[PDB]
Each structure stands twice: as structure tokens, then as C-alpha cells.
Amino acid sequence: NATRFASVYAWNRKRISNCVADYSVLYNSASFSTFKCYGVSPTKLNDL
Amino acid sequence: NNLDSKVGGNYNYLYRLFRKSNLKPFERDISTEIYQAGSTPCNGVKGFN
Ligand SMILES: *[C@@H]1O[C@H](CO)[C@@H](O)[C@H](O)[C@H]1NC(C)=O
């Protein structure tokens, strides 16, 4: 929900640790036009 | 690969990415009916979630 994003030549990156990662508030919103995974699935993220 | 793959690719080979539950041993599922992953019902060929 931030205002400005970095470029793809200088792509931003955030370290995540010391939190609980609730995907329900994220993934169950139609505001995303794409969501596609490569070693995991949306129906099991919160169990990982 | 040498008999079975193709230069732009072969794409006939479906697997299944979803199911309400695990299948029983030596079960075969041919159903292709849309997987309602979200809380919304979802008739028609696709939807969000
Ligand atoms: C069999 O079909 C019923 C009704 O749709 C369902 O409750 C059950 O989970 C299915 N079992 C398997 C192994 O697919």
C-alpha cells in the first residue's frame, strides 16, 4: 500500500523475519490481477 | 525427451494442481470442473481465486 515503487533495473527488496505472515488478508482480495506460484500453492501457504 | 518432447514444446501432458481432498490409492480423477479455491462460488470457465 506504499505510494512509490523502485524500478526493475534497481528492484527493491525487504527482509522478512520475526512476524506471522497472514495470507488471508492478502490473497483473498480480487485487487490482484496475477498470483502464480512455483514451489507452493495459495491453499497451503499459511501451513508452511 | 528425444521421442516425446517437441521443439516449441509439447503441452498435451496435464497434471492436476488442485483437489478438495487427497485421492485414495489407485484412484483416477477425470473431472475438470472448476476448483472454487476462494469463499465465492464460481460457475463459468474461470474466476479470481
Ligand atoms: C467422493 O465424492 C463425494 C461427493 O462429491 C465426496 O464427498 C468425497 O470426498 C469423494 N471422495 C473421493 C476419494 O474423491
UniProtKB/Swiss-Prot annotation, chain B:
Effect the entry attributes to changing T40K? In strain: Delta/B.1.617.2, Omicron/BA.1, Omicron/BA.2, Omicron/BA.2.12.1, Omicron/BA.2.75, Omicron/BA.4, Omicron/BA.5, Omicron/BQ.1.1, Omicron/XBB.1.5, Omicron/EG.5.1
* Mutation effect (A37V): Increased resistance to neutralizing antibodies
Effect recorded for N2K:
In strain: Omicron/BA.1, Omicron/BA.2, Omicron/BA.2.12.1, Omicron/BA.2.75, Omicron/BA.4, Omicron/BA.5, Omicron/BQ.1.1, Omicron/XBB.1.5, Omicron/EG.5.1
- Outcome of swapping L14Q: In strain: Omicron/BA.2.12.1
Effect the entry attributes to changing F48V? In strain: Omicron/BA.4, Omicron/BA.5, Omicron/BQ.1.1
Q: Specify the effect of S39N.
A: In strain: 20A.EU2, Iota/B.1.526, Omicron/BA.1, Omicron/BA.2, Omicron/BA.2.12.1, Omicron/BA.2.75, Omicron/BA.4, Omicron/BA.5, Omicron/BQ.1.1, Omicron/XBB.1.5, Omicron/EG.5.1
Known consequence of changing Y15F? Decreased HLA binding to NF9 epitope. Increased binding affinity to human ACE2
Q: Where is this region: Receptor-binding motif?
A: 1-49
**Biological function:** Attaches the virion to the cell membrane by interacting with host receptor, initiating the infection. The major receptor is host ACE2. When S2/S2' has been cleaved, binding to the receptor triggers direct fusion at the cell membrane. When S2/S2' has not been cleaved, binding to the receptor results in internalization of the virus by endocytosis using host TFRC and GRM2 and leading to fusion of the virion membrane with the host endosomal membrane. Alternatively, may use NRP1/NRP2 and integrin as entry receptors.
- Assembly description: Binds to host ACE2. RBD also interacts with the N-linked glycan on 'Asn-90' of ACE2. Cleavage of S generates a polybasic C-terminal sequence on S1 that binds to host Neuropilin-1 (NRP1) and Neuropilin-2 (NRP2) receptors. Interacts with host integrin alpha-5/beta-1 (ITGA5:ITGB1) and with ACE2 in complex with integrin alpha-5/beta-1 (ITGA5:ITGB1). May interact via cytoplasmic c-terminus with M protein. May interact (via N-terminus) with host bilirubin and biliverdin, thereby preventing antibody binding to the SARS-CoV-2 spike NTD via an allosteric mechanism.
Record protein name field: Spike protein S1
Organism whose genome encodes this protein: Severe acute respiratory syndrome coronavirus 2
Whole sequence portion shown: 439 to 487 of 1273
